């Protein structure tokens, strides 16, 4: 299991923290470009999707321990501008999920794979699995099988399996139980998850300041259950920004880092203003980013370096007694 | 192409220099540990080989762009202490070559492969091929087929093929042309070589200072032919220490960096005396390394920065104009 | 190239003929089972699909040189009753194609791949690509890219690439023949890596006149000979899909095709549709209907192939090796 | 597990019998051609090795349920004449074992693999592992690790793992113990053996007729032990000829089949005399292979259909109740 540990080390910074940036947005980027161009979403050229993902990778790489890129857009647009020492998490789940009456059904991106991600020099495989424990049996069986089959692929190619879990509405107190029980399920050893991309159990807006107050301790107990499931499974957990205001998301992180979270995954929030208001003027997008998005990014990174417990690689290698034992054992 | 270019980017430092450290020594390290312990080479226990390679990774990994490690000894000994940002080149050649009257015959390490190197999260595959153009047709066709088969495996796994070429003496019971024709043959597109680990075409002691003189003009011309072959093929090249003294090896680099070379691969010079004179006192070995090998390493990196042309990853991406084309094309 | 040659040899009988049977039908079998049960298709239990596939493999494996199985239904249903000597072709395309206004877009079955077909012991990979030369540039670009990416997967795993081409209507016999023939001409290009072709009739089965010395016959045979010519130049053997044509009509399509160089056929729905539809789940009554009709049709098709089809022969065309180690070094 | 079961089905005849022919001989076939030409073993040409293996495949393939071919010699010589319906078993162990004083060390053929055997369309991988339970710990550990890593390769590529076990003399009733304890050791689930290729546990010449006698019962007890080990582990077993006389190998098979064996993997017994005597005339070798050599094989198959118990595939699959569960589970 060397590749999984080494792969996760390449996603964390020199200190062992996960200061990740998500740049795999497919419809969100297309929609942000439809607003910037003033044209309908169906008229936005592919060239525009590329120039936007190239600009974001150039702008946010030097302040990210690792970046999440999708294969069809960000990989051809910015693989040559992503620094070598920045970790590369490659998206595997297809954005066009099946919205059935009993819940959402996930599948991999066509003509892409865990094997291909390993081949292209990717450091980790990422899968977002829309999940809620109250889904129909058919939907629960589909999602569990999909996550499991990807976990098997990642074990086969010894590559870090990064599972992002998200609850959804069918086509606040209840939501917190739906989140925790989703985390508990995919923390089972059969799924082979190596890193959790988790959403907050309680909304960012509903969070009181960190204090000994009964209100704050009842909220911290929700985060504590998540952190307890992840420490027992041995899986580090980071947090999706979710679009919450920078201060609201900073509070989410203060609560999460107390319960044991090891980092964050920054989303749209960072650049959604710079892209919509200034594309295609590259220089103008970089100005709005250097004062808003990159500021928040450096702040979240500083909060992680201070409050978050660093992750450490767990290399419990077998006792290699003779020359050749390692090559045989690694099979 | 993407995995090979990004893999190569992880072997060079931030600026694009290959300041690599060879740490895959098998018989030389065993012989260095025999002298350090008093006992003969056949009595050196496996635990000492691990202990030695772990000290050498801990003390040199931070002052190296990438490190070449062997699978059976260095992988289980120091994979946990190899920095995530330091590139990892894994040895594929079996050190026990066949010394036939007509030349040396090479093969891969048993139970180890290009596929396994891609799996552990290795950035590059290293193969040492013993080669003399004047070898027998049997030995020539054996070495050619072995190097070509590894290039095919490296192309299949889209991982950089780092080929090391060495000139050797024939079996003896009781110099520049041989290097240039070795470099020329394997530079052909059938071998798929991505990085060269070449030796100096003229001895290190024989090298005159870089003068306008016809002696230095004819000596630099030998390096220029090596550099022109590497440049026409598109294969960057690095120089291996090969036992030269600090000043002797620095002249080789001063000559090669003007001829095109993109860096160095430092070997036994850095730690041979530090190991042989102080093993197994860790505090003593690290002290000896700082005042000698580490000092040389710092000077070689400074010389590489002052005179070596930075290598650039040439991503010759076949332009994609639609969502799905990248996944389909990457096959 | 060895694996593709051995794989192709295992899809044909020891004479060289492709007497193949298609058992990868997903919605057509679901509709047949809904009609047998007297319930809606969305009420058909998954166990009925397995019982049907298993019935059909045991029944038709006697008269078939190779069989086409789909991974999610046929493979769990009947891999244990598929004879070791009957070749195994595994379906890769998803039956749920994207029905865009500009044309149909294809994709692989989720969580199934060429690497898995090679791993499980499959002899060949099968992809059906919906194709029209006059479809939109985007749809054309998608289909060409999908076909080519599976051809690359098949070269990497050295396994035969069986490609089936089918024309369809968007959401004249000479106008259909142009759509069919120009589809064959495109995917015969070397970049696609096609090893075997599963083709529909360029001219309708009903329209075909008797194979005599008339002008009507030479005109019809010309379309078959253009298909036969494109395939012989590319080195791709071609078989014919029954496509729901009546037995007499399919035997006529085969006579025209075999004269043009076709090396066999792939029998679909025709063989078992009514048998399953009328008697499922009474296992015996299904076999009894199959023996009196479908199995008789397959025996006739196999006999016609033995007499009139040209035998496919393997051409290993291996580069000569002169030393021990050369073969292992060259196969990489 | 599907590919393993179907691969075993393809090595057996329509009635589950293993009537296999081995023509992967490297040193034994070399010695036969050296004797046929008068010249030493070191003088036998490569073309002579190819022609001989091509004759055996043309002559015997139609009367064998499956054949065992080696990559370097029998594969380029006869893959084009090997019938589609004859199972192809491909050798993997290097014939040049390491003959240490403590015992024999095994390795795979250079540049060949289980991955390549799957790729060429081979139905099974074959490894011969030289074994004695009384060899040194260094040798026992090596053979154990080599057998185990190939089992893991065959599990990864879901391909039958045919393991041949052979006792040998150390350099420069007791035999039954070396044979039976070898069988016992590699029947352990960790090795992932799918089919056994075993030598007789009692010398072929020492065997009395198959009568209800004390001598017969004593010998049959050594065969029954092998049968029980194999039957408990669920591993079918076939007996290798070992160059024994035809009448002797029929007695070895009668005892083996009465104890549960499912066939044979006969080599030199069938064709050694045809090649050793009449090489290099094509018509003469094919006359002695179709008349005398094929008679032995035809008799061996006749005894097998009469007395050997059929092998039956256990396709005990994990039951699926929905569309997509097979593809998810097959990972």
TrEMBL record, chain D:
Keyword terms: Lyase
Biological process annotations from GO: 6-sulfoquinovose(1-) catabolic process
Record flagged with keyword Acetylation: no
GO molecular function (one): 6-deoxy-6-sulfofructose-1-phosphate aldolase activity
Alphabetical list of Gene3D superfamilies matching this protein: Aldolase class I
InterPro entries membership: Aldolase_TIM, DeoC/FbaB/LacD_aldolase, LacD_aldolase
PANTHER family cross-referenced by the UniProt entry: SULFOFRUCTOSEPHOSPHATE ALDOLASE
Family: Belongs to the aldolase LacD family.
Record's protein name: DUF2090 domain-containing protein
Organism: Paracoccus onubensis
């Amino acid at each position: 299991s060397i590749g999984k540990q080494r792969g996760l080390a390449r996603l964390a910074d020199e200190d062992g923290h996960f200061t990740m940036v998500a740049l795999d947005q497919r419809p969100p980027l297309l929609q942000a470009l439809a607003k910037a161009r003033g044209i309908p979403a169906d008229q936005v050229e592919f060239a525009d999707m590329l120039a936007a993902k190239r600009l974001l990778v150039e702008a946010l790489a030097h302040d990210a321990s690792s970046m999440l890129l999708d294969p069809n857009f960000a990989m051809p647009a910015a693989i040559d501008v992503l620094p070598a020492r920045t970790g590369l998490i490659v998206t595997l789940e297809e954005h066009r999920f099946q919205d059935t009456p009993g819940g959402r059904k996930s599948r991999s991106i066509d003509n892409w794979s865990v094997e291909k991600i390993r081949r292209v020099g990717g450091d980790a495989v990422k899968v977002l699995a829309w999940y809620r424990p109250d889904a129909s049996d058919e939907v629960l069986q589909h999602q569990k099988d999909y996550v499991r089959t990807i976990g098997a692929e990642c074990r086969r190619h010894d590559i870090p399996y990064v599972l992002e879990l998200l609850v959804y509405p069918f086509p606040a107190d209840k939501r917190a139980d739906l989140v925790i029980e989703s985390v508990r399920e995919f923390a089972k050893p059969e799924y082979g998850v190596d890193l959790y991309k988790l959403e907050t159990p309680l909304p960012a807006a509903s969070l009181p300041p960190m204090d000994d107050s009964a209100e704050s301790r009842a909220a911290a107990a929700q985060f504590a259950e998540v952190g307890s499931i992840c420490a027992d499974a041995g899986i580090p957990w980071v947090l999706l920004s979710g679009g919450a205001a920078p201060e609201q998301f900073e509070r989410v992180l203060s609560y999460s880092y107390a319960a044991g979270a090891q980092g964050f995954l920054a989303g749209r929030t960072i650049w959604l203003d710079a892209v919509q208001n200034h594309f295609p003027d590259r220089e103008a997008v970089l100005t709005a980013l250097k004062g808003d998005g990159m500021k928040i990014l450096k702040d979240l990174g500083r909060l992680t370096r201070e409050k978050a417990q660093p992750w450490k690689p767990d290399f419990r290698l077998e006792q290699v007694d003779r020359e050749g034992a390692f090559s045989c054992a690694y099979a």
